[PDB]
Structure formats: C-alpha cells, structure tokens
Amino acid sequence: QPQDLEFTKLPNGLVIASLENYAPLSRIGLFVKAGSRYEDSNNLGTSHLLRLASSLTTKGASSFKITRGIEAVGGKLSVTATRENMAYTVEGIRSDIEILMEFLLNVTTAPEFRRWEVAALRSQLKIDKAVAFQNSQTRIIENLHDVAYKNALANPLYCPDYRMGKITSEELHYFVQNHFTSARMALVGLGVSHSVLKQVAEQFLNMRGGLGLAGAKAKYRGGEIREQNGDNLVHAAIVAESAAIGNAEANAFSVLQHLLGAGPHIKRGNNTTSLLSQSVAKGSHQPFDVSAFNASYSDSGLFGIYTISQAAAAGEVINAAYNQVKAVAQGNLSSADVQAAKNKLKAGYLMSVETSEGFLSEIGSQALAAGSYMPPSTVLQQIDSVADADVVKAAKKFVSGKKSMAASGNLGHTPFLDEL
Amino acid sequence: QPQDLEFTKLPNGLVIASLENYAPLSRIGLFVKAGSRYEDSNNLGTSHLLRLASSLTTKGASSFKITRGIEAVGGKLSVTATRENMAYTVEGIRSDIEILMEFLLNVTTAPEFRRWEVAALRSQLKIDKAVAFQNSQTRIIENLHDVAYKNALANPLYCPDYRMGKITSEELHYFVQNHFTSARMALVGLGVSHSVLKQVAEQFLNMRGGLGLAGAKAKYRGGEIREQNGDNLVHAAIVAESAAIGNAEANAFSVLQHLLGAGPHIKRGNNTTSLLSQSVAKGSHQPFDVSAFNASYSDSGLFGIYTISQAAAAGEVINAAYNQVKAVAQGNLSSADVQAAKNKLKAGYLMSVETSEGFLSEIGSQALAAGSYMPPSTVLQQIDSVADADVVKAAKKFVSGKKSMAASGNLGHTPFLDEL
Amino acid sequence: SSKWLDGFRKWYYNAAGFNKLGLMRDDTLHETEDVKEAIRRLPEDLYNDRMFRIKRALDLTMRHQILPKDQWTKYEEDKFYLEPYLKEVIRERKEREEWAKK
Amino acid sequence: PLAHVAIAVEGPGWANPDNVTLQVANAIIGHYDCTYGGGVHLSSPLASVAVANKLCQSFQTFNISYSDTGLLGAHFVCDAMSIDDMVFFLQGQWMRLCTSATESEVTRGKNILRNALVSHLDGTTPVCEDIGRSLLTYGRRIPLAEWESRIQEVDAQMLRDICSKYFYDQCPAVAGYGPIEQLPDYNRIRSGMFWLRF
Amino acid sequence: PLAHVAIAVEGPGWANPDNVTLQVANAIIGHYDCTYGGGVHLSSPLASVA
Amino acid sequence: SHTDVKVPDFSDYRRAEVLDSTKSSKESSEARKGFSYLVTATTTVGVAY
Amino acid sequence: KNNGAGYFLEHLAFKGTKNRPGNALEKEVESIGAHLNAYSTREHTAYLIKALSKDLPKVVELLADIVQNSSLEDSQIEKERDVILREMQENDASMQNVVFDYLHATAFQGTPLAQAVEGPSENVRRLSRTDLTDYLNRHYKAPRMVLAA
Amino acid sequence: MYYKFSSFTQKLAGAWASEAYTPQGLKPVSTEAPPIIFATPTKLTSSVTAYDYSGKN
Amino acid sequence: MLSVAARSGPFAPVLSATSRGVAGALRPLLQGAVPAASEPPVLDVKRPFLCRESLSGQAAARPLVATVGLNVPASVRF
C-alpha cells in the first residue's frame, strides 16, 4: 500500500524523487550540495549565515509574508546542514502544501539578500553559535575536523568569531549563484504525486548551469589540538583516515563502529556487549563514556575513539580504549560479536528510516550521493556481505594510520599522540 | 670610577650582589626563580596575578602605605616576569632608598593575600592580558610556546580566560611558600653599599631556607597551530629544539641568529647583510619582515625563523627563508659574514648592559644561574671562541629537528609543516 | 504638461528655497516611522552625505545666510536618493496593514 | 571606539626658568593608563578620581617647548560617556594648582621631577640627545646639578603664582578626535578655566 | 544567571472535551526561543513583543 | 591624510591686535579680556541698579 | 611649498652617498654591528649612531657624508615618495599623533609651526630634487650643527 | 630596537624594534588621500593669513 | 651571557612581561588602551554529569548535523 517510490533525472541534472504515501501530511525537501565543504578562506561562515537567513525576503515573497503564511497554515520550515550538503524542508497538510512549495522555492531560487536584514541577523549568528557550543561535543568535533584536514573539510559549520560582522550579501549571492545550481539538487516529496513536483521544478528550478564549483579534494593533515578550559570531564577524540561513502569498506567500518560500541541499547545500562566500555569498566571505577566515532563523507572518512573521562583518569581510559582496539586489530574477536554488531547496525538503519524526517533525509542523501535510490532491503543485504576479515582490515587501517587528536578539559594527565 | 662588584652567599642560599658607583639614584632588585615554569594544570595564571600583586597589603605596610610612600619619594616599583624567573625592582633617589628597600622586602617576603583584594585584581589581569595581546607577535609567540612544549613552558605569561575569576588566595600563598624561598633568590643593589644589603638580608631574609619545589623538566612535542583571523598580514614562526644556556652551542645559536638576521640595525633599512632578508628580497616584490628567533632557557631552547608577509605571498617568503637556512646548513657561508655576525652579537650585548636596567637584569640572571660575576670581556672572548663548523652544525641541528609552527592570519597560501 | 508644467516645476523649485541651503528634496522630508526606517536602510555614503548636508543647512540657517548661487542645488541634478527605500517601506507597511485587516 | 582630546595653553619655551616650575606642576598631575597597578591609592588626585569613577582609559600631561613658545596641557583617551566629566575634573585640578597648592604636593612633584631628570639620562643615547638638544636650544649644556639647584628653588607660593600666570583665565586650544559630542563647546571649556570663588 | 518562572491555573484533565479547546488557546500563544528564525514576523503577539 | 587638515583663514572675524601671525600673543591678551570683562562689568552694574 | 623637504631628506639620507653608493653604506654600518637612527621635529633634525667606542673613527666618517654628501637619485626619490605615503597612512592610525598634529595646527594657525613635519600629501606627490637641493643648501650649514658624543 | 623619539615631552624614549626602526608599515600600497570639502568656499591660506586690506588700492 | 630576554634581540619584550606596581616618574611610551568591546550572550546553567548512568550516550559516534527552523528550536545532533 506504500506502493513504490518514483525517481526521475532531468536533463539539466536535477533529481526529482517522490512517493505517494496518501498520508494526512506532506513533507517536501530540497537537497543542495552547498555545505561548508565549498568555502575557501575568503568566505568562511557564509553557509551558516545562509542557513540562518533562509527566512528573509525573496524576489517573489517578503519575509513577513513567508513567516505569516507558513505559520498561518501551521506548516514547518526547517533547514538541516552538515559539512557536505544542506537540506530545506516544508511540512504541512496536503491541501496547503502546494503553496508551501512556492515559499520554499523562493528561498532557494530568488533571494534578494537585502543588506539591512543580513546586518540584522549577524547577531543571530553569534547567538546560534553560542547555543550550539554550549555542548562540548560540538567544539570537540569542530576542532577534530579542523585538525584532521588541510582544506575544504577543516572549514567549520559555525562561523568564526572574526567573520561575524564581515559577511556581506555579495558573498551570499556568490554562494547561491555558484552552489545552488541545477545539477546539485534533489527535490524529494512525501505525500505528493510526480506531476505537481515536475511542474514546480519546471517553474522555479530550471535556470542555472549545473556543474558549479567543485572544491579542494580534502587533503588529510593530522596533528592534535588541546584546549584547556577547566571542566569536570575531559573529552578526547582520536581518529584516523577511513574509507568514504560508496566505498566497499564503509560497511566494514560501520560494523566495527557497532562492534566497539556506538550507543547504549539499554537506558541506565552497563554496556555489556560494548568492547571499549567493557575494557574501561574493568579498568576504572569513576564515571566515563567511551564509544567509536565514524564519519564518512563524499571522498574521505574518519574513524576513531571518543572518550569522556575524569580529569585525573584520562590517560588510563584513553590507553584502555586504544589497547582494546589494538587487540581487536590482531584478530581477537568472535563471530557472534560480529553478528551482533551487524544486527545493531541494520537495526539502527531500519529505526533511522522509520519517521518521515529520517526517510526523506535518507532519500535525499542517496539521490545526492549515488543518483540512484536503493531499497532498504538492498542496504541490509550489502550489510550482510561483510566478513570479519574486512573488519580486522578496518581495525588495522585505524591502527596503522596517522592519528588526529582533539582534547578539552583538565589536560594534566591526558596523553599525547606519540605517547599512545 | 666604581670599585668591582661584590658578592655574598648567605647560609640560607641567598645571593647578594652590590655595586658601589655613587649614582644619583639607586636600583634595588630581587630576582626569584618563580616564573610560570613552576605551575601545572591546576594553578595556571597564578604568576600573572602574583605579578600584579606587588601593591597589595603586606604586614608592615598596607596598599595605601606602599603606594603613597613609593610615590611620595618619587621612586618606582616594577616587576618583570619571564617564563623562568621574576624580578622585583625598586628605584629611587639615594637618600631615600633604604625605606624603599623595606617596601620591596615586604612585597617579596610576607604578602597578606587577602581575598577581597585579589577579587578586585582579577579584572585588572583581564585588562592587562587584553592590552598585551593587542599586538600579533605576542599572541603568536604564546601560541608557539604552547605548541612547542607539552609541560612547564607551555604555561603562558598571561592568565587563561577560563581561570580569571577563579584564582584564590590559597593558590597564591601556596606558590609563594613553595617558590619564594631563600635558596632561589638574588638581592642586587646598584648604588648602595654592601653592608646595607647584608644588614637588610640578615634582618628579614631568614624565613624559608629550603630549595623549594623544583624539577618540572619541560619536554618537547612539536606540531602546529593556525589561528585564522583574516588579517592582511600573515605571521609565522617555525622553530625547533635547540641547546639551553650553559653550553657553547648556545653561543653557536646566537651567532647563527645574528648571521641569518636578528632584527634591524638601520631605520627604514633593507637588512642587506641579513641572509634571510637577502633571499626573500630576491624573491618577493612586496613588503616583508624576516628575522631569526632564539629563545634559550636553562633546560631547553627554541630556535627558528619568524616571518611577517602578505596574505597571498606568504608561501614564497616562508619557503625562501627555509631554503636559505637549508643552504647555510650545508656549509655555504662566508667567514666575513660570521665575523660580522660576531660583531653584531657583541655590540648588542655591550649595548644591552649599557643602561642600568640591562646591567641589573644581566647581573640578576647571572647571580640566579651561577652566583658569580661574568665580566663582559669574558663574554666577548667566549663569543670569539666560536668556529664556523659550530654554526654549521647548529643550523644542521635546526633543519633535522621536528618543527613547531605557529601561524596567524589569512592562511590560504600559507603552507603546512609537511611542505617545508 | 509639456511646455510650462516643467517650467513651473523649475520656478517652484527655485521659489520653495531649500536648494539655496544645499539641501536635496528628500532631505526636507519630515520623519515618520516610514521615513526613519528608510533612512536606517540607507548605505553609509548616502547617509553621511545626507547628515552633512543637513548640518550644513542648520549652520547656514543659524547665521541667516544662504549658499552662493553656483552652489545652489540644481533642479535637474537633484537626485531622489531616498524614495525607492521609502516606497519599499510604505509597501511592506501596507502589506502588514492589509494582513491585519483580514 | 575611543576618543582622544588634547587641551593646551601657552608655555614660555626653552630659555625661561619657570619651565622647571611648570614641570613640577605636571609632576603633580602626572600620567595614568589602565594597566597601572596602584588601585584607588594613587597620589595624583585626577588619577584617583578617574579610577574611582571609571572615566579614563589614559591621561597624560605635557610641556612642549620651541623658540620662545610652547604648548602646556593634557591629553586623554576615554570613551564617549566620560569625556565631559573628565574635562571638568581636569580643569579643576589646574585651578587647584592656581589657588590652593600645598607644600607636600610640591615636595612630591619635586621628587618626581628629580627622578625623571636623573633616570631619563640612563644610557648614552638620551645623554647624547640632551647634549645636542641643549647646545641647540639653551646654547649650552645645563648640568644636572644646575637642574637640582633650580628644582630646590620651587616652593608652593611661586608655583601657584606661576600656575595662575599660565593657566588661570586663559583661552585654551582644544583638539579632539573620535566620538566627541559629549566634549563641550569652547565656551564651557573656556569658562572652566577660572573659578567664580577664585 | 537568569530566572525561570512558571505560572499555571487549574485545568480539567483528560475526560473533559474542552481540553481540546484549551489546546487551541495554547496554539494561539505558542512558544518562542532565542534561536528561532522568523524574528519579529511571528504570528504570536507574545513572541513578537518578546 | 590627517596632515591635509588646515585651519582656514579667520582674518575677517579676527580681532585687530591678533591679525598678523608674526607677532606673539600674550602681549595684548590682557587688553582683550579687559574689554570683554569691562562689558560684562558694566552690564552687571546696570542690572544691579 | 617645500613642507616635507626635511622629512624627505631624512628618508633619503640613509639610501646612499657619493662615495658610498646605496646599500654598501648600509652594509658598512651592519659590518660593525652599529645602530643607525634619525628623527625630525618641527625645529630639530638628528642623525645618531650607537656603536662601540673602539670604532669611533669610521662612524664619524659615515656621519660626515650623511650630512654633506647625500646622493639624491630619481628612482630613490620615487620609491621613498611611496614609502612616505605609506607611513603617513600608517601614522593616521596612531590617533594620539593625529590629535598632536591637530593641536599644533589649531594652536599655531597661520604660522610655520602649524604644518606637520611630513607635510601634506600633495607636496609628497609633487616635490622635486631641486627643491630638496635648495633645502639642504639653505639649512644644512655648519654653524647650525652640533656634533654630540 | 632601542630608542624612538616620542612621548609628548620631546624625548628619545624606549620603543620596540618593530616601530623604532621600521616606522613605515608592511602595508603594500597607499590607498587614497580623501580631499576636504567645505560648506562655503573658504580661503584656507597657510602663509600670511590670506590678505589684509580695507578697500581698493 | 645570561638574561634570557636580552639573548633575543628584538624578542626581548615578547618573551617577557613587565608590569609596574607603582608607576614611576617617566611614563612608558605607548600607554595603550582597550577598546570597549562587546559581551558574550547569557546562557542557562547546563547539565552536569556526576554518574555513569547520565554519561551514557554522551560520547559522539556520528558526524555533527545542525538544524535551524522558523518556529522550532535550533538543535545539533551527533
């Protein structure tokens, strides 16, 4: 009864994928390869300001009209961004969602970017960065990606403190005209038909070239950053280079992630089938949390160990986790552990694609990455093809690589990269 | 004409140096080995507050009495802190100086360290850090020190921003009672008789006879820091491990920095006899400033190049300077250049002790290190006893060592440490 | 409209008398919320030129003087710098008012 | 972000002895910036007032001499909201030196001037500068013992007579740069240069 | 650093259908956070004045 | 530059004894303020009457 | 009309003489490790050298041609005109110097003591070698010079 | 490195090497000299205070 | 040749810091003044972690994804 998702590749490169849910509510997204990946040092923090400035005036709809008309029908407008790509989403009732797309396409296609409004929401940039940096995992991953790469992936999600007050509307216009092109977009619809989506793509979307600007290939750097800030807990991420999205080894790295532990399956549990948690639990007697970090991108990936530990116990926690990974890389693991890891991974995927937000995010990600949507059963089938030898190869890939380290807290007894 | 300098080693380890020259005003300084070397991760910035605690209440004098009594005789109290030692210097007209001495005595022996006064002083240390980091050389040198060393010299001269509002009186009392001991201090008087200094030292320098807490043992790590601030100029310091003070290799490294160019000699000059400036001026047709950095401590040393260049032409300047050091590391140099480097070094040393402040600072550091006078002629002949192969092997020890890099500015064209 | 209305506009521009204080037309507009928002939306160059012209006019009207006749603002060279900003502010205020009607 | 204001009057020049007295007057008012570590206990009244009320970022007095002319006055940098208050305070200090200078204040200024004159000539560069400038201006090298003899002549009565001669009821020259609309007009600055109570 | 204040009155519970009516009343006033996107143009007059 | 700022000539409004720039001031300043304070003193005497 | 002549000679004084053409002169003082400095006020100009006492003769010889044998070349005039424009742009940022110049101008209106030492920008753009020669022939005579040591 | 003439007292004070011996900055090109316009046409004469007369000579 | 600050020629005042508790007769050149800078925004008190049960799940495992909205709060998920 959820019949089939239909897929369409227009000759200008634009992707349209839609599914006829016959749902009470419709969700329509536009996925653009316009992340923080596509900034050089001249225009840092432009994507953050564009993400915040989606709700400004457009050549065809004013910001009062956009805000009041979205709130008048009860719909939602959201922008979700990562380093690689941005996504615009409207949510509404089926009878209204048509005119909702009108608002969305204005936000994508004809932004006026008036100077006074940009000058108004630079303060919103400062507030949003403060709120997002209230969590320490944010600044750990930001410094980790800054140190781990030389160019095009060391650029932050959040605008640096010097570029605030220095971003003009001309830079946003340049970013739109160079990255919001036709062959970098996927228009995804849930609760709609193909005809209306093809009509609105023919109306608003079919004017730009399509190739745009490529980027700078994300050369690996390595090194470490240590930020002494005086908290109760010390955060430390140690990563190394790993395979990208679409490589045959990304599945093995995800299996190794769920084998080493990537989240508590039981609330207030003890993480029995997590190897890193087992090693640090038999080691220490203080509060801690250790997990495996995976982050695969279009042409690169990072795999490593994340540790939150006490200030005077960080060295033994980090060394226990690292020696656990070193013991995994020598082949000391059981087949039932790999089977439970595959179960954890495919369970996480299937419970990630259940809601409409996660489903539409996965459709847009697949359309932007591969250009060909695959069913979840095919994803589970290629998960099932991972052998344990490829997991041991992934662990040896982590062990025999140049590590990148990011640490924060009281670093009195936190070790260094050569000391590991 | 004065008589020669007079020394006394008291049984509690206090060194006393005095020069009787019948100066119109006299200079009294106490030199303590209590810099920022001796902190750890828990009491960072204690030396910065202790530097500004020189006008607080002691026993025997209040803040009002100290300030009004030093300003009433026209005298001056200052304190200069390096990363290894501090120096408390009072000066004033001769007929008053004894009362000035007891003021310095109180500031160096029995501080009260009340809580309300240090709570008032922490805002002043924030303001002082802002004034100090207004220029870019200070910021990049403190970053370079934080990257080059992992302990005991990564502690900056100025208090970290998280520690402000958190330094209590107990940390100051602990620091004074563990580092302001009589076996680590030198009392030096220019323009005062030896009996006056010996009488004051026998009066109130008989409380802390131990050697204090010592043995921090700074270690070298290397790496790089890259502060993107988007300025038009790019600063970059690239250093490496070099010999400490107490060696002929330290003389070789000083001859090496004056051979490569160690600052200007001519107002609006071109630095023609500087090798680095010659190479970069042959390369670049834009303004620049290349010099040689040499920070020698008692346990380790940093030697490298410091470059200021334009934002886009930074790579050419940095690579030309590094290739110039590489070329002079392979024996390609002339002995007339080494003789001019020796003349520059000895002229700078004789101009340093030309004023009374440089002479008192030099004899305070000599009394702290060896406890005995090194006459300037012995320093000149030790400069003269340096061969060319020593400078060649010093540059070879620089080029073969792992570098510490600190960069600041628009680093789009600035290279990384793998590309030197 | 062709022959003398432009001529009567030139004569009225001379007769009103803000040109002999160096002012443009849009400098003479009395502030409202709309005019203050339109002034706030101006770029820095036109804002600084406007404020210098205004305080020059206040200096001249202090001493009961006028500019020399060659420094009078010409009728054709008089630019209407503010009125697109003012028209945009008026248009968005009218949009807000008609939304508040329904 | 900050505003600099310099106020001045005439000073007599190089070859008039009461310059020494005027130097003592500057030593009474002195200099301050935000990194001075005295607190609320500085001897200069203007410095203690500006610390307590949080007015200044820095102030600095000067005496500048050319051939039978010069500029004598003060220069301060502060934020906008402080400017007017400090001008009042600064002018009040001058009027105090015109009317009610005491003896310990003059003694402190004399000791400050002794230390400034001796400790400025430390090293061969400022000594050589003093030699060349003294042969060009005074026609001779004034020895430091002659300076000490002229400083010892200064007491409170002749100091407030000289300060009334050079400051009281005189038209200043005011220069300003920055956010300076709280800096008053010339009439209020000129009216602040005299007391209605004398 | 900053204060949390809650004001409530007695409401009916589950079984009373006018609860649904009360929900619409809350949907007129709604919510506001400092990290929103609409700005002054939100329809809620409390959020707009806040 | 800031050195391009030059004060314009004020010689039309300027008083008579301060006209030439080659003559020192503080020679007739007392006469100028004596005239202005005499104007103020005569005004105060009249309003006191 | 020669309002920046002393400043522009103060720039070109270290750029070469008749017997020491260009940077070789500069090389000479660096070859003895000495420090060479200058300043120019509204009334006085100074060229001073810190050196060692043991090289007292050579430095005096250098000082000699610096005050009487300066080779004023056209290319050096062009590039030092650009350097002077650069540091008037730099000294515009030093805001207390700006208020210093403003105070001198407004206090000494109509007199030669109002003009700055570096002068206006147009005089930097237009000044010629003959004007500098007239300034140095008029004001660099021996009765007005003090050799201080 | 050692002495720069400054400090409002006309004295050779002590200053850092980057400003005592390099007074011109590292900025490459001078940008502009913005001209001064006045309200009225003023006779901003530097020498001899414009003219002194009272009629036609 | 001691006096580690004077070992470095131009890098004497950068390696050292010279406060003045009682400022003397001669003023230092370049007095210096902080500009009136801005202030950081205020935020509520966060959640401390004092037990192993609260710390579970806090270790990051996925790349950082930020989300803003017109009337939904801004969030970051790892």
The span from the CA of B332 to the CA of B392, in Å, is: 9
Domain-located, residue D47: yes
The third-level CATH classification (topology) of the domain covering G1-149 is Cytochrome Bc1 Complex; Chain A, domain 1 (3.30.830)
The span from the CA of A297 to the CA of B136, in Å, is: 36
How far CA E47 is from CA of B101, E22, E42, in Å, comes to 66, 19, 7
Inform me whether the C-beta atom of residue G57 falls under 8 Å from chain F C-beta atoms. Answer: no
Give B97: exposed, middle or buried? Use CB within 10 Å, 0-12, 13-18, 19+. buried
Phi-psi region of D7 (alpha: psi -120 to 50; beta: other; left: phi over 0): beta
How many Cβ pairs closer than 8 A exist between chain A and I?
Answer: 120
What φ, ψ does residue B170 adopt, rounded to 5°?
Answer: -70, -35
Instruction: Please give the angle made by the CA atoms of B403, B404 and B406, to the nearest 5 degrees.
Output: 135
Confirm if A40 and A150 have CB atoms less than 8 A apart: no
Shared domain for A205 and A251, answered yes or no, is no
Mutate to test the interface with B, among H21, H30, H31 (most CBs of B within 10 A): H21
Sequence-distant (≥ 6) Cβ neighbours of residue D156 within 8 angstroms: D101, D102, D103, D105, D106
The span from the CA of A172 to the CA of A191, in Å, is: 32
The span from the CA of I70 to the CA of A90, in Å, is: 11
Strands A185-190 and A15-19, by their bridges, are parallel
The 10 Å Cβ neighbour count of residue E13 is 7
Name the nearest CA neighbour of I40 among B162, B231, B139. B162
The encoded tokens of residue A236 equal: 């430390």
In total, chain A counts a number of residues equal to 420
Confirm if A380 and A348 have CB atoms less than 8 A apart: no
Per CB-CB distance under 8 Å, the chain G contacts of D177 are: 95, 98-99, 102
Shared domain for A28 and A169, answered yes or no, is yes
Name the nearest CA neighbour of B125 among B232, B32, B17, B52. B52
Q: What is the dihedral of CA G40, G44, G50, G53, to 10 degrees?
A: 160
For residue B238, what are the β-bridge partners? Answer: B305, B405
Test G105 with F9 for CB contact under 8 angstroms: no
Shared domain for B39 and B129, answered yes or no, is yes
Instruction: Please give the angle made by the CA atoms of H32, H36 and H40, to the nearest 5 degrees.
Output: 160
Name the nearest CA neighbour of D108 among A154, I77, B71, B401. B71
The CA distance from I72 to the nearest CA of chain E, in Å, is: 7
Name the nearest CA neighbour of A304 among A220, A225, A219, A398. A398
The encoded tokens of residue G39 equal: 């300043």
What φ, ψ does residue G106 adopt, rounded to 5°?
Answer: -75, -15
The 10 Å Cβ neighbour count of residue F46 is 8
The span from the CA of A419 to the CA of B18, in Å, is: 48
Counts for chain C of helices (H) and strands (E), in that order? 4, 0
Give E21: exposed, middle or buried? Use CB within 10 Å, 0-12, 13-18, 19+. exposed
The CA distance from B199 to the nearest CA of chain I, in Å, is: 25
H-only helix segments in A330-414: 335-350, 356-369, 376-384, 388-399
Q: Chain A residues contacting E, CB < 8 Å?
A: 52, 54-55, 63-64, 66-68, 71-72, 77, 120-121, 124, 127-128, 131
Inform me whether the C-beta atom of residue A68 falls under 8 Å from chain C C-beta atoms. Answer: yes
The CA distance from D196 to the nearest CA of chain H, in Å, is: 32
The 10 Å Cβ neighbour count of residue A334 is 9
Number of domains in chain D: 1
The span from the CA of G20 to the CA of G34, in Å, is: 17
Instruction: Please give the angle made by the CA atoms of G47, G51 and G57, to the nearest 5 degrees.
Output: 85
Test G98 with F2 for CB contact under 8 angstroms: yes
Inform me whether the C-beta atom of residue G104 falls under 8 Å from chain F C-beta atoms. Answer: no
Instruction: Tell me chain D's radius of gyration from C-alpha atoms.
Output: 17
Inform me whether the C-beta atom of residue G114 falls under 8 Å from chain F C-beta atoms. Answer: yes
Shared domain for B288 and B322, answered yes or no, is yes
DSSP secondary structure of B346-380: HHHHHHHSSSHHHHHHHHHHHHHHTSS---HHHHH
Domain boundary among A216, A250, A269: A216
Nearest-Cα residue of chain D relative to residue I37: D1
Confirm if A393 and A252 have CB atoms less than 8 A apart: yes
Do F and G touch, 3+ Cβ pairs within 8 Å? The answer is yes
Test H26 with B268 for CB contact under 8 angstroms: no
For residue D56, what are the β-bridge partners? Answer: D78
Domain-located, residue D118: yes
Instruction: Please give the angle made by the CA atoms of B72, B78 and B80, to the nearest 5 degrees.
Output: 175
The 10 Å Cβ neighbour count of residue B399 is 16
Name the nearest CA neighbour of H46 among G109, G99, F1. G109
Inform me whether the C-beta atom of residue H12 falls under 8 Å from chain G C-beta atoms. Answer: yes
Confirm if A268 and A341 have CB atoms less than 8 A apart: no
Which of D4, D131, D135 lies closest to G95 in CB terms? D4
Test D33 with I24 for CB contact under 8 angstroms: no
How far CA B133 is from CA of B144, B163, G59, I20, I29, in Å, comes to 14, 17, 39, 17, 17
Which amino acid would we find at residue D163?
Answer: C
Return the DSSP state at A84: S
Shared domain for A133 and A165, answered yes or no, is yes
Name the nearest CA neighbour of A143 among A412, A417, A404, A409. A404
Mutate to test the interface with H, among B258, B267, B356 (most CBs of H within 10 A): B267
Mutate to test the interface with H, among G2, G35, G37, G82 (most CBs of H within 10 A): G37
The span from the CA of A394 to the CA of A242, in Å, is: 8
Test B416 with A150 for CB contact under 8 angstroms: yes
Per CB-CB distance under 8 Å, the chain E contacts of I69 are: 36-37
Shared domain for B96 and B209, answered yes or no, is yes
The span from the CA of I49 to the CA of A308, in Å, is: 10
Test C68 with H40 for CB contact under 8 angstroms: yes
Confirm if A412 and B42 have CB atoms less than 8 A apart: yes
The span from the CA of B341 to the CA of B338, in Å, is: 5
Nearest-Cα residue of chain F relative to residue G87: F1
The set of chains that have 3 or more CB pairs under 8 A with G is B, D, F, H
The set of chains that have 3 or more CB pairs under 8 A with I is A, B, D, E, H
Confirm if B293 and B329 have CB atoms less than 8 A apart: no
Confirm if D38 and I23 have CB atoms less than 8 A apart: yes
Mutate to test the interface with A, among E26, E41, E42, E48 (most CBs of A within 10 A): E41
The set of chains that have 3 or more CB pairs under 8 A with E is A, I
First to last CA, chain C: 41
DSSP secondary structure of B265-311: SBTT---SS-HHHHHHHHH-SS--EEEEEEEE-SS-EEEEEEEEEES
The encoded tokens of residue D101 equal: 């200078």
Domain boundary among B172, B194, B216: B216
Test D132 with G148 for CB contact under 8 angstroms: yes
First to last CA, chain F: 56
Phi-psi region of B247 (alpha: psi -120 to 50; beta: other; left: phi over 0): beta
The span from the CA of C30 to the CA of C36, in Å, is: 9
Per CB-CB distance under 8 Å, the chain D contacts of F26 are: 10
Name the nearest CA neighbour of B233 among H26, A166, H31. H26
Residue-range domain boundaries for chain G: 1-149
Shared domain for B209 and B322, answered yes or no, is no
Shared domain for A45 and A10, answered yes or no, is yes
3 state SS of A74? coil
Domain-located, residue D120: yes
A147: containing domain:
1-216
Sign of CA dihedral B112, B117, B118, B119: positive
Query: Residue D30 sits in a domain of what CATH number?
Result: 3.30.830.10
The span from the CA of G47 to the CA of H5, in Å, is: 12
Which of A52, A287, A291 lies closest to I61 in CB terms? A291
Number of domains in chain B: 2
Inform me whether the C-beta atom of residue H2 falls under 8 Å from chain I C-beta atoms. Answer: no
Test A41 with B228 for CB contact under 8 angstroms: yes
Confirm if B397 and B247 have CB atoms less than 8 A apart: no
Shared domain for A204 and A55, answered yes or no, is yes
Shared domain for A228 and A175, answered yes or no, is no
The span from the CA of B303 to the CA of B318, in Å, is: 15
Beta-carbon-side half-sphere exposure of residue B28 (alpha carbons within 13 Å): 28
DSSP secondary structure of chain D: --EEEEEEEE---SS-TTHHHHHHHHHHH-EEETT----S--SSHHHHHHHHHT-EEEEEEEEEEETTEEEEEEEEEE-GGGHHHHHHHHHHHHHHHHH---HHHHHHHHHHHHHHHHHHS-SHHHHHHHHHHHHHHTSS---HHHHHHHHHT--HHHHHHHHHHHTTT---EEEEESS-SSS--HHHHHHTTS-TT-
Please list, residue by residue across D122-151, b when 16 or more beta carbons sit within 10 angstroms of its beta carbon and e when fewer do: bbbbbebbbbbbbebbeeeeeeeeebeebb
The CA distance from A80 to the nearest CA of chain I, in Å, is: 4
Instruction: Please give the angle made by the CA atoms of B373, B378 and B380, to the nearest 5 degrees.
Output: 130
Domain boundary among B167, B201, B216: B216
Q: What is the dihedral of CA B400, B404, B410, B416, to 10 degrees?
A: 40
The span from the CA of A261 to the CA of A274, in Å, is: 5
First to last CA, chain B: 54
Sequence-distant (≥ 6) Cβ neighbours of residue A37 within 8 angstroms: A83, A84, A152, A153, A155, A215, A218, A297, A298
Mutual orientation of helices D19-29 and D156-166 as an angle, nearest 10°?
A: 90
Resolution of the determined structure in angstroms stands at 3.3
The CA distance from D85 to the nearest CA of chain I, in Å, is: 18
Shared domain for A355 and A412, answered yes or no, is yes
Test E37 with I70 for CB contact under 8 angstroms: yes
Domain-located, residue D32: yes
Residue whose pair of structure tokens reads 């070329």 in the numeric block: B327
Shared domain for A30 and A10, answered yes or no, is yes
Which amino acid would we find at residue G36?
Answer: L
The CA distance from A155 to the nearest CA of chain E, in Å, is: 23
Residue-range domain boundaries for chain C: 1-102
The CA distance from B68 to the nearest CA of chain D, in Å, is: 6
Return the DSSP state at B245: S
Name the nearest CA neighbour of A273 among A288, A283, A287, A262. A262
Give B265: exposed, middle or buried? Use CB within 10 Å, 0-12, 13-18, 19+. buried
Test I59 with A289 for CB contact under 8 angstroms: yes
- How was this one solved? cryo-EM
The set of chains that have 3 or more CB pairs under 8 A with H is B, C, D, F, G, I
